[PDB]
Design brief:
hetero-oligomer of 16 chains, A: 43 residues, mainly alpha, B: mainly alpha, 2 helices, 0% strand, elongated, binds bacteriochlorophyll A, binds Anhydrorhodovibrin, metal ion binding (chains A, E, G, I, K, M, O, P), chlorophyll (chains A, E, G, I, K, M, O, P), membrane (chains A, E, G, I, K, M, O, P)
Chain lengths: 43, 55, 55, 55, 43, 55, 43, 55, 43, 55, 43, 55, 43, 55, 43, 43
């Protein structure tokens, strides 16, 4: 009877993929910031 | 209790469509990408050096 | 009467999807993040020093 | 388990309408294309050389 | 049981008209680009 | 298997309304056309030569 | 079983009025372009 | 097959409401007209000669 | 079985009020244009 | 066939709510009026003579 | 069987409050215009 | 026929929620008020005298 | 059979909290205007 | 007839979610807050003194 | 029979997480304001 | 009982076409970047 309508199992499986993709997005963003800093320092 | 297995990407990528109904979301996805292309063009086109308008 | 237990994060984070149906909200979430990226690019790109357009 | 066959385009293109209901999406598609035409006109028209207003 | 709810026959008939209209739109757009180029060359 | 016959336009144009419900889409269509008229007016009116404001 | 839900008869009747109104809109727009050209030539 | 009779306007104009449900569309129609009035005012008001702000 | 769901009677009654209100809006708009022209001529 | 009687305004004005459900439309109406007030303020406030910011 | 779904009684009661609130809004707006005119005349 | 009694405000104000479902409209109301606060801030903040940015 | 679907009791309870929160918002806004006036007078 | 008791805040704050379904409104709330952060950044970032772009 | 459709238990559990996350957001925002003030004082 | 309502087979078939179209879009975009670089170098 969840607010979303998802089962616990669905929520956990969804969360596991979300975390994986989010982590890769953040790693790529961190790399992008490193490169942009080498190209054009800020602060 | 239940612990989810670690997904393998890109092998498990098709499971996106088990969450996102492309009947609802494909056109919004394509419109979102179009908006990005318009915004990128707006920035680049605004530079006179990068636009074809030469007359 | 009923008192809720203190949640533990990030352990309990998966419970977001018991509230937010990702069928409805995943694409809007990703579009929201795209909008942020466009807006950040608009500010940074506007500085001539931080854009690749060099011709 | 089940493996999808490689689609052949443009032969399989009609299958778009098995996903996207044109009852819902045709007018939004045409409005999206109109928006593109307006935005393209805005950029090109803004150049005095490329607009008919000569008086 | 299509995602859209259309039959195969409906999708094919829809696609046939879409292609026809799209083709005429593109031909007209090509003509427009030709005329605009004659009026005001670009590049 | 099934092959669609080539449509004849404008004879078959009325079949648009077998796809697009005008109950839903007529007002959005007319609003879209209004938006175009506003945008065209914005560009043309902005030229001082093409607007009636002469005082 | 139309995608829109309209009958053939409804679609044809709708189309007949659409064409009538569209035609008058276009005639008025043509007149407007003629007058604006007399007032302020373009091209 | 079935051929539609030529409509007579403005006699047949009331048939708009057999297509467009005013329960849904009257307020959007009036808001659309308001938007036009705002946009027209924006253009005309922007001319200092045509606005009351004289102080 | 109208597309809108309105009866003929509802559509006609709705149209009668629409026409009345539209007419008064247009008369007021015409008066506004007359006054604005007296205050600040245009063209 | 049926001919509608001429309405009497403002006597018949309450019949608006037989068409427009205020459950759906009252807040949009009030938001529309707010938007007008914001736009009017934007034009008038923009004139330095008509705004309180004097420091 | 109203288009809105409201009863006559609901529409009339709604209208009565609408008129009351609208009237007070207009009186306040009139006062605001009077004060703004005293502070900074226009026209 | 039926004549409505004159409402007494603010005594009868709670009857707003008999028309407007706060389940649907409370968040839009609060977002509308937020938009007003943003717009007011935009005008006032734009004056250099009224913003904290002093460095 | 309310337009909103709320009971009288729900509407009154909702209104009571609305008034409380609105009142605190207005008091805070009044304080903010007082402070901003001390910092940078207007008018 | 019925008189509501005075609420006690923040004790009664959880009753917001008896009105506002977070399934519908949590993501819009978070997007609204994001919009505020973007707008605040737009104003502050626009001041050259308050942005990191130093090259 | 809540307006939202949530049970009391769901509303309380939701509120408990909301408060936790809100609190951390505010602490981070406070830290951000402190750092920005050290970097570039305001007022 | 998928969140989307799609079967596994539908999701896989959808994904196969998505990948094909995405790949062609990316190849075309890469070609566009190559040409634009030849026309007007950047960085
Ligand atoms: C403005 C100053 C710098 C610059 C500095 C930065 C910095 C710093 C960053 C970027 C980032 C981005 N830049 Mg940049 N960038 C510049 C100029 C450009 C130009 C241009 C026209 O010149 C373009 C087109 C771009 C485009 C991009 C995007 C590719 C990317 C933002 C993606 C996004 O929207 O995330 C938000 C949108 C979403 C999250 C929605 C979903 C998108 C997809 C689906 C993400 C899923 C992740 C998944 C795991 C990917 C798997 C694939 C492979 C592992 C790669 N940059 C200049 C040179 N750019 C960001 C980035 O790299 O992010 C990783 C970033 O941090
Ligand atoms: C800016 C520089 C040039 C200029 C260069 C170009 C170029 C180049 C093009 C245009 C095109 C267009 N220009 Mg231009 N144009 C100029 C100035 C103007 C002015 C003006 C105020 O001065 C106006 C009003 C226009 C208006 C137009 C439109 C008629 C058209 C975009 C339609 C559209 O939105 O497609 C997008 C919207 C949709 C697809 C939505 C649906 C629209 C309809 C329903 C399309 C269905 C097609 C159907 C088969 C038509 C059947 C009818 C008959 C066969 C004709 N141009 C100046 C002189 N213009 C484009 C065009 O001609 O497209 C064919 C085009 O390629
Ligand atoms: C900018 C340079 C010129 C100018 C040149 C033009 C040109 C050229 C045109 C206009 C057109 C229009 N101009 Mg102009 N116009 C100028 C300045 C103005 C000013 C002003 C404040 O100065 C205003 C208020 C307008 C207003 C208008 C509108 C009346 C009209 C666009 C309608 C529309 O939105 O169609 C799009 C919206 C819709 C289609 C939505 C539905 C609208 C209705 C319901 C249409 C149904 C048609 C129906 C059969 C009408 C029956 C009634 C009677 C037969 C009349 N113009 C200056 C002087 N103007 C256009 C026009 O006349 O169109 C016919 C047009 O071609
Ligand atoms: C810009 C140059 C001139 C000016 C020239 C004009 C001209 C010309 C016109 C206006 C019109 C309007 N002007 Mg002006 N106006 C000026 C400066 C202002 C200023 C200001 C801050 O200075 C304001 C607040 C306004 C405000 C207004 C509105 C009252 C009105 C547009 C209403 C509308 O949105 O219709 C569109 C919105 C709708 C149709 C939505 C529904 C609105 C209501 C419900 C209409 C129903 C009609 C009903 C029968 C009314 C019954 C009540 C009584 C009979 C009165 N003007 C300056 C001085 N103004 C127009 C007008 O008077 O229209 C009648 C008009 O033609
Ligand atoms: C720009 C030139 C003048 C100025 C001239 C005017 C003039 C002239 C007017 C205003 C009006 C308003 N001005 Mg001002 N105003 C100025 C500068 C400001 C500044 C500022 C940052 O300096 C602010 C915050 C405001 C704010 C306001 C609002 C309080 C009000 C518009 C409300 C609205 O949105 O109605 C539209 C929105 C709605 C109708 C939505 C619903 C709002 C509520 C629920 C209305 C219900 C009415 C109900 C009966 C109220 C009961 C409560 C008590 C009886 C009071 N002004 C300067 C000094 N201002 C207007 C006004 O006073 O309206 C009454 C008005 O006519
Ligand atoms: C621009 C000139 C002045 C300034 C003058 C003012 C004045 C005058 C005011 C503000 C107000 C606000 N200012 Mg300021 N402000 C300035 C610069 C800033 C800067 C900045 C980047 O420099 C920021 C981030 C802000 C931010 C803010 C917000 C905290 C607040 C508007 C809230 C809102 O959206 O209400 C509208 C949105 C809603 C109502 C939606 C719901 C929001 C919440 C849920 C409200 C519920 C109330 C509840 C009872 C709160 C309980 C908690 C505790 C009792 C506190 N100011 C400068 C220094 N500022 C206003 C304020 O204080 O309001 C109280 C106000 O009157
Ligand atoms: C908000 C909605 C849900 C929730 C849903 C999720 C979801 C969904 C996810 C998480 C994830 C996380 N959650 Mg959680 N989470 C919730 C509530 C919480 C609470 C809490 C106390 O309420 C906590 C402590 C956490 C904690 C966490 C983390 C363990 C993890 C995110 C790590 C990360 O992003 O780095 C912080 C990163 C940044 C702050 C951005 C960094 C960008 C940098 C700064 C780029 C700039 C560099 C450049 C050089 C600039 C120069 C230097 C500058 C001056 C800085 N969550 C609630 C219940 N949470 C994620 C996860 O587990 O991943 C494995 C994940 O996918
Ligand atoms: C403009 C002047 C200063 C600056 C001064 C400030 C100040 C002051 C603040 C920020 C804040 C932010 N700044 Mg800044 N910032 C600057 C330049 C930048 C640049 C850039 C391109 O240079 C970027 C990308 C950013 C980006 C950011 C964001 C990371 C953050 C706003 C988040 C948000 O949207 O909250 C609103 C959106 C939401 C609430 C939606 C949901 C977001 C998530 C899910 C929040 C949940 C919280 C959860 C518990 C997190 C768990 C994870 C771990 C515990 C970390 N800043 C410069 C250097 N910046 C704010 C911040 O730090 O907030 C904490 C803040 O107070
Ligand atoms: C601004 C500097 C350069 C320029 C540099 C670039 C660069 C670099 C790129 C473009 C790209 C594009 N440019 Mg450019 N471009 C310039 C000036 C223009 C002008 C103009 C008025 O001068 C126009 C109209 C365009 C138009 C375009 C589009 C055709 C294209 C973006 C499509 C899109 O929205 O993808 C986003 C939208 C979607 C994905 C939505 C769906 C669109 C369709 C359905 C995609 C499906 C793919 C499918 C497999 C196609 C099958 C058909 C055939 C195989 C071809 N350019 C100038 C000369 N341009 C991009 C491109 O080529 O993409 C491939 C690109 O990378
Ligand atoms: C049963 O069988 C079935 C189901 C019927 C089979 C049928 C299947 C069918 C028909 C299936 C069709 C499926 C179809 C058409 C797929 C189509 C897929 C495409 C075309 C993908 C494309 C994606 C592209 C992306 C993501 C792009 C991201 C860009 C991003 C983020 C940039 C961000 C940029 C910035 C911020 C920088 C801004 C800098 C500034 C402003 C200077």
């Amino acid at each position: 009877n969840s607010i979303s309508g998802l089962t616990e199992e669905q929520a956990k499986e969804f969360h596991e993929q979300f975390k994986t993709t989010f982590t890769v997005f953040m790693v790529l963003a961190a790399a992008a910031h490193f490169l942009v800093f080498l190209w054009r320092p800020f602060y | 209790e239940y612990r989810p297995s670690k997904p393998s990407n890109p092998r498990d990528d098709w499971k996106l469509w088990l969450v996102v109904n492309p009947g609802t979301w494909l056109m919004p996805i394509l419109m979102a990408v179009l908006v990005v292309a318009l915004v990128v063009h707006a920035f680049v086109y605004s530079n006179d050096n990068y636009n074809p308008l030469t007359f």
